[PDB]
Write a protein that binds this DNA or RNA. Sequence first.
RNA 1: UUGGCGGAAAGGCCUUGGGUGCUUGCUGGCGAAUUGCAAUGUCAUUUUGCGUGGGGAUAAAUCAUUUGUAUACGACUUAGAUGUACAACGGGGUAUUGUAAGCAGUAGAGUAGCCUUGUUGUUACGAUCUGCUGAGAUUAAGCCUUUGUUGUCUGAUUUGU
RNA 2: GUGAACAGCCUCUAGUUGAUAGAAUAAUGUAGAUAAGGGAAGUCGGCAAAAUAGAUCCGUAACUUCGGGAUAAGGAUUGGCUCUAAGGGUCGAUCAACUU
RNA 3: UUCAAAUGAGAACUUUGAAGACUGAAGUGGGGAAAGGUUCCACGUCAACAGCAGUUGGACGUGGGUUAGUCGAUCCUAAGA
RNA 4: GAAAUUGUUGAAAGGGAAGGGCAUUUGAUCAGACA
Lengths: 107, 97, 337
Amino acid sequence: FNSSIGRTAQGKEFGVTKARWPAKSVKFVQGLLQNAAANAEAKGLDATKLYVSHIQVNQAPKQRRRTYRAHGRINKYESSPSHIELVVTEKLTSRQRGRIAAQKRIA
Amino acid sequence: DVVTREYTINLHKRLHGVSFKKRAPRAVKEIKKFAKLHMGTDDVRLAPELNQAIWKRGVKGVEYRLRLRISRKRPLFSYVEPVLVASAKGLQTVVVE
Amino acid sequence: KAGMTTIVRDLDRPGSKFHKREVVEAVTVVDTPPVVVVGVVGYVETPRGLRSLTTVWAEHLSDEVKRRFYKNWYKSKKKAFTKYSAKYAQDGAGIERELARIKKYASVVRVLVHTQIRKTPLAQKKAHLAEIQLNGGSISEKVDWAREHFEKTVAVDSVFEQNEMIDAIAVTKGHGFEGVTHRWGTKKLPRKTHRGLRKVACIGAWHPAHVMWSVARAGQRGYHSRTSINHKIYRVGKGDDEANGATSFDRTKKTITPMGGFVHYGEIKNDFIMVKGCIPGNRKRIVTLRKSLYTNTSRKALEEVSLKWIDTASKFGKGRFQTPAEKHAFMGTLKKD
RNA sequence: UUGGCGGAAAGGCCUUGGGUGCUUGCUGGCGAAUUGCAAUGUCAUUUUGCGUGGGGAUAAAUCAUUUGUAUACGACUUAGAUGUACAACGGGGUAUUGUAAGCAGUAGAGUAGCCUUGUUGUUACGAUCUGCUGAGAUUAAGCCUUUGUUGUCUGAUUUGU
RNA sequence: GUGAACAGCCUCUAGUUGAUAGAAUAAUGUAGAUAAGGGAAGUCGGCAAAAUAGAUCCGUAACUUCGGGAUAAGGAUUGGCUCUAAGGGUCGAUCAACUU
RNA sequence: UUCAAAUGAGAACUUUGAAGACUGAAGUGGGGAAAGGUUCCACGUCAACAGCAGUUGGACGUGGGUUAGUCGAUCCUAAGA
RNA sequence: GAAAUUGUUGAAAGGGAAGGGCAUUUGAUCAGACA
Ligand SMILES: [Cl-]
Ligand SMILES: [Cl-]
Ligand SMILES: [Cl-]
Ligand SMILES: [Mg+2]
Ligand SMILES: [Mg+2]
Ligand SMILES: [Mg+2]
Ligand SMILES: [Mg+2]
Ligand SMILES: [Mg+2]
Ligand SMILES: [Mg+2]
Ligand SMILES: [Mg+2]
Ligand SMILES: [Mg+2]
Ligand SMILES: [Mg+2]
Ligand SMILES: [Mg+2]
Ligand SMILES: [Mg+2]
Ligand SMILES: [Mg+2]
Ligand SMILES: [Mg+2]
Ligand SMILES: [Mg+2]
Ligand SMILES: [Mg+2]
Ligand SMILES: [Mg+2]
Ligand SMILES: [Mg+2]
Ligand SMILES: [Mg+2]
Ligand SMILES: [Mg+2]
């Protein structure tokens, strides 16, 4: 989802030109990473070996508002919420037989 | 370490060609950037007395030069205060004991 | 390129109204410290064009040239040409072997030279490296000449002379994205024009159903390569010679640098070339001066030029005095002194 | 292993010397089966990876910061680990305006007041004028220069035939 | 306060400081501006813009229903400062207005 | 528009102080007719709403609040019904 | 708890569309007789 966005030099690390800094989405991911690490410690897993083995984002039901347009028209004005989940884990034929037999006694 | 010095900042060349409605707010950010260069502190706090000196002659009447006292204190932050002098001309950087 | 100034000279042109009369002309000054030879290259003719066969480098290279090979010089270990210098640590059989190959096979010989950027008032500190073709003599003579000049300096006066037509190659000043009105010089649309008037009204007919390559469009202006020919040399200047800006008529003791220095450049402390007219590129930009590709005899060349006066007033304003002494004599004593 | 030659994409060709293997040029002696009446009946060269040991060599780029000869954003062009280093101030030069503040004057159209009626009476009010004063102010923000002052100089990421 | 003025411009009382923000300053725009010499050659067309502008004094044509046209057209003056003259009230004296 | 403090898990936007500004009395000031109907005030509180934000609110939850012999209606008549 | 539409994982192909018909190679996968 990168059509008509800007380009920056900080994208050269990952071999792309277009990249951004979505602060709001980062904070939500940070909270779940903290919660998963707490759950891993409670179970008794080794923290130094933990890596993100699964992370998945799904579309939640939309939240609807209204926007007013020219000539007395009304259009939709909606948000796109997210479902986030993640998991951390510790790191022969007879002729062939005759040929084989012949080779064994030949060398 | 903790140190206090007195500086002269040339605001004339830093506000060259700036929109009139933004000159006084821009001078506030220039002073914070000035303290970052000399003290290397991410946190810069300006005394309200300094804020009055910047806005003394309106939004577009910033003085050409200002005499500043910058103190680095306790991880570390910089505190900027004005210095009461007749003129800011001819003064160089000095260390305050 | 340092800047421009003005000169006065007599016109030697029979049949002209201003024959044997003074004229005022604009000139361009190029700061040209000596270049340093640091290598040679041989080229071989091929059905697919010229191909470089072998490059031979000098034993020692200064930090100016080595900076050209780095993007992060301050962090580097500076290992460039460390193993190559060991080829000279022996008798020199490896170096002599490659030189013999150039003599045997090459048909075109060029020398690698770099500028002494530290002698200019610039802040770059990184030298410019380039290839210059050698003309005259056999292939063996060219290689021998290059070998003897390793780590040496070649002065500008040994290349060009007075009253010589030369060509200037440089990149023009950049202006970024520009509209069609100034990029191509198209006519401005009437004041009544809706949706803007600094445009081209019709960009193409219905057929062919495409915009053609020959239609003016908005885009980058400036920063292009240009080659301007037939520029006459008015003076070959000496860096160590006081009274660079003096003539046989003016006789005053003054250098070529104007009062207050060249704007955005500084002072001229090295050898320089004075070129009639204007030159592509802006101040502080590296330029290449090349000899002409043909023998010009249009009587515009072959004319002997003798300067009478060189302007040295300040270019930072409406300068009125050539030298500090002139200002003091006209004004007298001031409160400052 | 010896020597020479080949640069058009040479990466090949020719030659000296010895070692060792084979020789169907000629004459001999042994072995073959059963893959069962054919089944490609597997004998080539491409690339890469993991383990053996015999030698060889001990870097850079990018982000962040900085520069404006560059620039919509990317990109481009510069600088930065101890220095003819860089930066912030200060000094000088070069420019612009046109004579600062303050103090003083027997300069100043005139009009008032006091006793002592003063042959410049003093003292007040007074646009302006004169002197100190081609003074004062501003000057790189994309001007030049600097034996001065004060500081700064090891954070992050990635790349292997 | 300025001024003829409930004009425009600045201030006291009182009331707000609300309109998504930060960085940069390409092209093309929207809005506001300036231009050497020429002066409508532009264009269907002076569209747009420019010029004129307050007040005092001088001066003012054809035509006319005699009321107008008329601010016709066309000229001059305007600051600051120090003075002078004239224009009043109440009962010689005494007190108080901005107008020219 | 800016600086600081206070509060808060969290402050370009809440509160307080300081500074810079505007409306400039035919006002961004102080009251009403019609129309709206609790939006008024306090406490608590932020899922949704205030096209950014929000600890704030004309939002959400729970309560409180409009006192007349003299102010109006009521009475009179107008065009008219 | 279907479809449009979407996320993750796995496999495969991609030099200015994609999809289809006939035939076979390769990969993956699978039923039928052992009389
Ligand atoms: Cl609608
Ligand atoms: Cl850039
Ligand atoms: Cl524009
Ligand atoms: Mg696109
Ligand atoms: Mg767009
Ligand atoms: Mg709308
Ligand atoms: Mg409507
Ligand atoms: Mg041109
Ligand atoms: Mg139109
Ligand atoms: Mg100039
Ligand atoms: Mg004009
Ligand atoms: Mg003109
Ligand atoms: Mg015409
Ligand atoms: Mg015409
Ligand atoms: Mg008009
Ligand atoms: Mg206003
Ligand atoms: Mg106001
Ligand atoms: Mg309320
Ligand atoms: Mg919102
Ligand atoms: Mg919110
Ligand atoms: Mg269900
Ligand atoms: Mg589906």
